[PDB]
Amino acid sequence: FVNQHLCGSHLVEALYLVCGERGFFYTP
Amino acid sequence: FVNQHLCGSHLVEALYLVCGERGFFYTP
Amino acid sequence: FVNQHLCGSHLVEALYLVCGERGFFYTP
Amino acid sequence: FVNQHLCGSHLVEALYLVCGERGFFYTP
Amino acid sequence: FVNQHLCGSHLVEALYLVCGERGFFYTP
Amino acid sequence: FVNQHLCGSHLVEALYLVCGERGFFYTP
Amino acid sequence: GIVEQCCTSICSLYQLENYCN
Amino acid sequence: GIVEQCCTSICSLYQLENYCN
Amino acid sequence: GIVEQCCTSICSLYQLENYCN
Amino acid sequence: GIVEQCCTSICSLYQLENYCN
Amino acid sequence: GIVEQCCTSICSLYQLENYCN
Amino acid sequence: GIVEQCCTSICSLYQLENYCN
Ligand SMILES: *N[C@@H](CCCCNC(=O)CC[C@@H](C)[C@H]1CC[C@H]2[C@@H]3CC[C@@H]4CC(=O)CC[C@]4(C)[C@H]3CC[C@]12C)C(=O)O
Ligand SMILES: *N[C@@H](CCCCNC(=O)CC[C@@H](C)[C@H]1CC[C@H]2[C@@H]3CC[C@@H]4CC(=O)CC[C@]4(C)[C@H]3CC[C@]12C)C(=O)O
Ligand SMILES: *N[C@@H](CCCCNC(=O)CC[C@@H](C)[C@H]1CC[C@H]2[C@@H]3CC[C@@H]4CC(=O)CC[C@]4(C)[C@H]3CC[C@]12C)C(=O)O
Ligand SMILES: *N[C@@H](CCCCNC(=O)CC[C@@H](C)[C@H]1CC[C@H]2[C@@H]3CC[C@@H]4CC(=O)CC[C@]4(C)[C@H]3CC[C@]12C)C(=O)O
Ligand SMILES: *N[C@@H](CCCCNC(=O)CC[C@@H](C)[C@H]1CC[C@H]2[C@@H]3CC[C@@H]4CC(=O)CC[C@]4(C)[C@H]3CC[C@]12C)C(=O)O
Ligand SMILES: *N[C@@H](CCCCNC(=O)CC[C@@H](C)[C@H]1CC[C@H]2[C@@H]3CC[C@@H]4CC(=O)CC[C@]4(C)[C@H]3CC[C@]12C)C(=O)O
Ligand SMILES: Cc1cccc(O)c1
Ligand SMILES: Cc1cccc(O)c1
Ligand SMILES: Cc1cccc(O)c1
Ligand SMILES: Cc1cccc(O)c1
Ligand SMILES: Cc1cccc(O)c1
Ligand SMILES: Cc1cccc(O)c1
Ligand SMILES: [Cl-]
Ligand SMILES: [Cl-]
Ligand SMILES: [Zn+2]
Ligand SMILES: [Zn+2]
C-alpha cells in the first residue's frame, strides 16, 4: 500500500494544477 | 493571487493526509 | 536505495503535519 | 501564522536533502 | 528573498508537469 | 512509466535546491 | 470556501477534516 | 478509481481532467 | 525572468509553457 | 527505524506520532 | 529557532546544516 | 540522461550538480 500512498500524493498535486479554479473530487 | 495559489498547493497536500481513505472535495 | 529516498521525502512531510508545534526527530 | 506554516514545509524538505543519512531535528 | 524561494519551488513543480517529455530550462 | 514520473518530480525539487541561483536544465 | 478560510488565518487539521468526503 | 487507473500505468494530464469538478 | 514574471503576479499554465525546452 | 518501519509496509498517522518530539 | 531564523530572511543550505543530527 | 541515471540507482547531490546551468 506504500506505493499507492506515494502515488496518490502526486496525483492530488497534479489535479490541483490541472483543474485550476474548478477544483476536483479525490477518492482513492 | 500568487499567495493563494501557493497556499492551495499545501491545503491539498494536507487534505490528502488528513482525509485518508475518505478522500476529499477541493474547491477554491 | 532510490525507493527509500522517495519514501523518506514523504515521511518528513507527514511528520511535519502530524507533529505540529512539537516538531520531530528524523533519522533514517 | 499561515506564512510560517508554508515556510516550515519547505524548511523540512530542504533539511531532508541537506542532511542525508544524518537526519535532522526539526522544532519550530 | 524567502517568498521568491518558496515561489520558485512551486514554479519548478509546475514546469515539470506542464512540459512533460520536453523538459524545461529553469533560471531565476 | 509511473515510477519514473514520481522520481522525476523529486529530481526537479532536488535540482532546484542544489543549483540555487544558477538554475538547471531538466530533460528526461 | 477553503482558500478564504485557511489562506489568511491558519487552519487546524481538525478544521480541514470538514472537507473530507 | 484514480489509484487503480493511474498508479500502475501512467495517466496523461488529459485523463486527470476527468476528476475536475 | 520567470521569478519576476510569476512570483508577484500569477502565471497561467499557458505562460509557463514558454520555459519548456 | 522509520524507513525500515514505514517504507515497505504502510504506516498510520498514529504510528508516525511516535517520532514527534 | 529555525522558523524565526529562516522564514523572514533567507537561509543558505550551509546554515540549514546546523540542524542536521 | 538523468532519469536513466538517477531513478534506478540513487544519485548523490554531487552528481545532480552536473545538471546545473
Ligand atoms: N478510490 C476508489 C476505490 C475505493 C473503493 C472503495 N473502497 C472499497 O471498496 C473498500 C475495499 C476494502 C475493504 C478492501 C480493498 C483491499 C482489501 C485488503 C487487501 C489485502 C488483504 C486481503 C484479505 O484477504 C483481507 C485483508 C486485506 C488487508 C484486505 C482488507 C479489505 C480491503 C482493504 C474509488 O473511489 O472508486
Ligand atoms: N472556492 C470557493 C470560492 C470560489 C467562489 C466561486 N467563484 C466565484 O464566485 C467567481 C468570482 C470571480 C468571478 C471574481 C473573484 C475575484 C474577482 C477579481 C478581483 C480583482 C478584480 C476586481 C474587479 O473590479 C474586476 C477584475 C478582477 C480581476 C476580478 C474578476 C472577477 C473575480 C475573479 C468556493 O468553492 O466556495
Ligand atoms: N535511520 C535508522 C536506521 C539507520 C541505521 C544507522 N546506520 C547504520 O547502521 C549504517 C549501516 C550501513 C553502513 C549499511 C546499511 C546497508 C549497507 C549496504 C547494503 C548493500 C551492500 C552490502 C555489502 O555487502 C557492502 C556494500 C553495501 C553497499 C552496504 C554498505 C553498508 C551499508 C550502507 C535509525 O536511525 O535507526
Ligand atoms: N521552534 C522554536 C521556537 C519555539 C519556541 C517554543 N514555544 C514557545 O515559546 C511558545 C510561545 C507561545 C505560547 C506564544 C508565541 C506566539 C504567541 C501568540 C502571539 C499572538 C497573540 C499574542 C497575545 O497577546 C496572546 C495571544 C497570541 C495568539 C499569542 C499566544 C501565545 C503564543 C502562541 C524553537 O524550538 O526554539
Ligand atoms: N532568473 C532571471 C533573473 C536572474 C538575473 C541574473 N542575475 C543577476 O543579474 C544578478 C543580480 C544580482 C547581483 C543583484 C540582484 C538583487 C541584488 C541585491 C538587492 C538588495 C541589495 C541592494 C544593494 O544595494 C546591494 C546589496 C543587495 C543585497 C543586492 C546585491 C546584488 C543583487 C543580488 C533570469 O535568468 O533572467
Ligand atoms: N531525458 C533523457 C532521455 C530522453 C531521450 C530522448 N527521447 C527519445 O529518445 C525518445 C524514445 C522514445 C520514442 C521511446 C523510449 C521508450 C519507448 C517505448 C518503450 C515500450 C514500448 C516498446 C515498443 O516496442 C514500442 C512501444 C513502446 C511504448 C515504446 C515507444 C517509444 C518509446 C517511448 C535525455 O534527455 O537524454
Ligand atoms: C495545513 C494548512 C495548509 C495551508 C493552510 C493552512 O491554513 C493550513
Ligand atoms: C501526473 C501523474 C501523477 C501520478 C500518477 C500518474 O499516473 C500521473
Ligand atoms: C503555477 C504557478 C506556480 C507558482 C507561481 C505562479 O505564478 C504559477
Ligand atoms: C504517511 C506516510 C508516508 C510515507 C510512508 C508511509 O508509510 C506513510
Ligand atoms: C531552503 C529554505 C527553505 C525555506 C526557507 C529558507 O530560508 C530556506
Ligand atoms: C535526490 C534524488 C532524487 C531522486 C532520485 C535520486 O536518485 C536522487
Ligand atoms: Cl514518490
Ligand atoms: Cl509556499
Ligand atoms: Zn514522491
Ligand atoms: Zn510552498
Task: Explain what this protein looks like in three dimensions.
The complex is a heterododecamer, with six copies of chain A (28 residues) and six copies of chain G (21 residues). By secondary structure, chain A is mainly alpha-helical. Helix content of chain A is 64%, strand content 11%. Chain A has one domain (1-28). Chain A has one helix at residues 2-19, and one strand spanning 24-26. Chain G is an all-alpha fold. Chain G contains two helices and no strands. Chain A binds chain B through residues 8-9, 12-13, 15-16, 21-28, and chain B through 8-9, 12-13, 15-16, 21-28. The structure holds ligand UZ9 (6 copies), M-cresol (6 copies), chloride ion (CL) (2 copies) and zinc ion (2 copies). One M-cresol sits between chains B (7, 10-11, 14) and G (6, 10-11). Chains G, H, I, J, K, L: This is Insulin A chain.
**Helicity range of chain G:** 40-55%
Main beta-sheet annotation of chain A: none
Counting helices, strands and paired strands, the structural category of chain G is: mainly alpha
Strand content of chain G: under 5%
Form type of chain A: elongated
Count of DSSP-assigned helices of chain A: 1
**Gyration radius of chain A, to the nearest Å?**
10 Å
**Greatest chain-chain contact:** A-B, 14 and 14 residues
Number of domains of chain A: 1
Helix fraction of chain A by DSSP (H/I, runs of at least 4): 55-70%
Topology of chain A as a string of helices (H) and strands (E) = HE
**What coarse outline of chain G follows from CA principal-axis ratios?**
flat
What's the main sheet of chain G like?
none
Number of strands of chain G: 0
Q: Nutshell version of this structure?
A:
The complex is a heterododecamer, with six copies of chain A (28 residues) and six copies of chain G (21 residues). Chain A has 28 residues and is mostly helical.
